[PDB]
Amino acid sequence: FRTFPGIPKWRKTHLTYRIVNYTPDLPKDAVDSAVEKALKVWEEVTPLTFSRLYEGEADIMISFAVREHGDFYPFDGPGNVLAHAYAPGPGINGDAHFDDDEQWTKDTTGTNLFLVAAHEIGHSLGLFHSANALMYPLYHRFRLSQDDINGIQSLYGPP
Ligand SMILES: COc1ccc(S(=O)(=O)NCC(=O)NO)cc1
Ligand SMILES: [Ca+2]
Ligand SMILES: [Ca+2]
Ligand SMILES: [Ca+2]
Ligand SMILES: [Zn+2]
Ligand SMILES: [Zn+2]
């Protein structure tokens, strides 16, 4: 496992998130389910408790965007970069973005939103790319690996 430069971590247990907008590809409940389920993957093996917000600035702002979208890492159309997220911190830090030129699916016939979001939320909680592993930098009965659990626990702690 690997962490971000300067070992950044959330300095609180209660974290908030907001889904700012939605992909055309799925219904909103399917997006909510994938994201909500993506947060539980990490919530289950840490003392972190997530809460949802509909107004205002949440810690983890979740949005779908294409090309240039307000940060130093513009998306690249279909394929290549599917999504990116930021390390723990204020502002853009902690936020997760999804490239809406990909075809986001409930299943595997396109790009699975749940799997990518789980990997993206890993970035939101301070995990960088692994060497084996959900945090491995390539998209390919799902379970969180020991290498993944090592990083989040040796940072926040166990439940
Ligand atoms: C399923 O987990 C992922 C998520 C995204 C990607 S990727 O978009 O191809 N690489 C960018 C990346 O590392 N985002 O966090 C690769 C694997
Ligand atoms: Ca943020
Ligand atoms: Ca892309
Ligand atoms: Ca799309
Ligand atoms: Zn972005
Ligand atoms: Zn990644």
UniProtKB/Swiss-Prot annotation:
GO terms for molecular function: endopeptidase activity; metalloendopeptidase activity; metallopeptidase activity; peptidase activity; serine-type endopeptidase activity; zinc ion binding. The active site is at residue 120. Keywords: Calcium, Collagen degradation, Cytoplasm, Disulfide bond, Extracellular matrix, Hydrolase, Immunity, Innate immunity, Metal-binding, Metalloprotease, Nucleus, Protease, Repeat, Secreted, Signal, Zinc, Zymogen. Ca(2+) 1 binds at residues 25, 100, 102. One of its GO terms (biological process) is cellular response to lipopolysaccharide. One of its GO terms (cellular component) is nucleus. It comes from the Eukaryota. Zn(2+) 2 binds at residues 119, 123, 129. The keyword Isomerase does not apply. The conserved cysteine present in the cysteine-switch motif binds the catalytic zinc ion, thus inhibiting the enzyme. The dissociation of the cysteine from the zinc ion upon the activation-peptide release activates the enzyme. This is Stromelysin-1. The lineage of its organism: Eukaryota, Metazoa, Chordata, Craniata, Vertebrata. The chain holds residues 100 to 266 of 477 of the full protein.
